[PDB]
Enzyme design. Structure first.
Site, PDB file in Angstrom:
ATOM      1  N   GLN A  21       0.805  -1.221   0.000  1.00  0.00           N
ATOM      2  CA  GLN A  21       0.000   0.000   0.000  1.00  0.00           C
ATOM      3  C   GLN A  21       0.842   1.277   0.000  1.00  0.00           C
ATOM      4  O   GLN A  21       0.303   2.366  -0.238  1.00  0.00           O
ATOM      5  CB  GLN A  21      -0.913   0.014   1.227  1.00  0.00           C
ATOM      6  CG  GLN A  21      -0.136   0.118   2.557  1.00  0.00           C
ATOM      7  CD  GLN A  21      -1.083   0.203   3.727  1.00  0.00           C
ATOM      8  OE1 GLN A  21      -1.486  -0.833   4.251  1.00  0.00           O
ATOM      9  NE2 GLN A  21      -1.458   1.374   4.154  1.00  0.00           N
ATOM     10  N   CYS A  27      -5.230   0.946   4.056  1.00  0.00           N
ATOM     11  CA  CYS A  27      -5.360  -0.412   4.565  1.00  0.00           C
ATOM     12  C   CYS A  27      -6.798  -0.928   4.500  1.00  0.00           C
ATOM     13  O   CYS A  27      -7.022  -2.125   4.301  1.00  0.00           O
ATOM     14  CB  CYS A  27      -4.812  -0.513   6.001  1.00  0.00           C
ATOM     15  SG  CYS A  27      -5.723   0.345   7.225  1.00  0.00           S
ATOM     16  N   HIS A 157      -5.325  -0.612  11.965  1.00  0.00           N
ATOM     17  CA  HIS A 157      -4.815  -1.221  10.749  1.00  0.00           C
ATOM     18  C   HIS A 157      -5.709  -2.381  10.322  1.00  0.00           C
ATOM     19  O   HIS A 157      -6.041  -3.266  11.128  1.00  0.00           O
ATOM     20  CB  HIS A 157      -3.354  -1.674  10.957  1.00  0.00           C
ATOM     21  CG  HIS A 157      -2.674  -2.132   9.702  1.00  0.00           C
ATOM     22  ND1 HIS A 157      -2.699  -1.372   8.539  1.00  0.00           N
ATOM     23  CD2 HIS A 157      -1.888  -3.200   9.440  1.00  0.00           C
ATOM     24  CE1 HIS A 157      -1.999  -2.005   7.607  1.00  0.00           C
ATOM     25  NE2 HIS A 157      -1.497  -3.115   8.125  1.00  0.00           N
ATOM     26  N   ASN A 177      -0.744  -9.075   5.302  1.00  0.00           N
ATOM     27  CA  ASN A 177      -0.546  -7.617   5.408  1.00  0.00           C
ATOM     28  C   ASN A 177      -0.305  -7.071   4.016  1.00  0.00           C
ATOM     29  O   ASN A 177      -0.160  -7.819   3.047  1.00  0.00           O
ATOM     30  CB  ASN A 177       0.654  -7.332   6.342  1.00  0.00           C
ATOM     31  CG  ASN A 177       0.581  -5.980   7.043  1.00  0.00           C
ATOM     32  OD1 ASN A 177      -0.224  -5.105   6.678  1.00  0.00           O
ATOM     33  ND2 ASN A 177       1.476  -5.771   8.007  1.00  0.00           N
TER      34      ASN A 177
END
Length: 214
Positions: A21, A27, A157, A177
């Site tokens: 990202q 996120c 997050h 992630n």
């Protein structure tokens, strides 16, 4: 519901390669999109990488690189759909909502009862789950192993549960992630599962959500 002791959706071909990202606070979009990509494959579609950039630019209920909500993206994908990463590449800066071919729509989304890791496991056995966690410095500095470090103080997050397992009797979640393949275990973190606090490790179980199709 019969629950397998370990699950890894990457082994079933349901995860596209890890993404990055960048500095943009998107996120929320990465967490929504990965769950949609996986479900499309799980339900018999082709695995296709889908556009987080389209979410950043088009989901006006959220705030682009200034944060947002996985559920805002799910609502948008239900009504308007989502384009491929090929057609709408990620640039990490909010721009106008650009028109591109729609790959798919979803039908809705659901939540899981709060603070219930065994309920999270039941859904995780069936599909990729969007979750929201409390990241601080220990999480940022994770390299390998089963993470049991300290946590941030605020949910901040969005990430994804892509499976679960155990190592030497220690249970964990496999968490995707959006910080590129050089972070963690090839972009993933194994986080301790079934902790005494029912919120789970850094809040994994506080607010899980997942898309539905059909």
């Amino acid at each position: 519901f019969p629950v397998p002791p370990s699950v890894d959706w990457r082994e079933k071909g349901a995860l596209v390669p890890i993404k990055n990202q960048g500095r943009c606070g998107s996120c929320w979009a990465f967490s929504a999109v990965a769950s949609v990509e996986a479900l499309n494959k799980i339900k018999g579609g082709e695995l296709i990488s889908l556009s987080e950039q389209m979410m950043v630019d088009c989901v006006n209920a959220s705030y682009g690189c200034k944060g947002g909500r996985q559920t805002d993206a799910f609502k948008y994908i239900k009504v308007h759909g989502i384009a491929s990463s090929k057609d709408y590449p990620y640039v990490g800066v909010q721009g106008p909502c650009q028109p591109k071919e729609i790959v798919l729509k979803i039908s809705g989304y659901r939540g899981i009862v709060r603070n219930n890791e065994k309920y999270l496991q039941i859904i995780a056995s069936q599909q990729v789950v969007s979750i929201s966690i409390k990241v601080g410095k220990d999480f940022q500095h994770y390299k390998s192993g089963i993470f049991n470090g300290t946590c941030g103080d605020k949910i901040n997050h969005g990430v994804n549960v892509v499976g679960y397992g155990s190592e030497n009797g220690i249970p964990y979640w496999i968490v995707r992630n959006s910080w590129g393949k050089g972070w963690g275990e090839q972009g993933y973190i194994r986080m301790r599962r079934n902790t005494s606090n029912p919120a789970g490790c850094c809040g994994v179980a506080i607010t899980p959500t997942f898309p539905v199709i059909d």
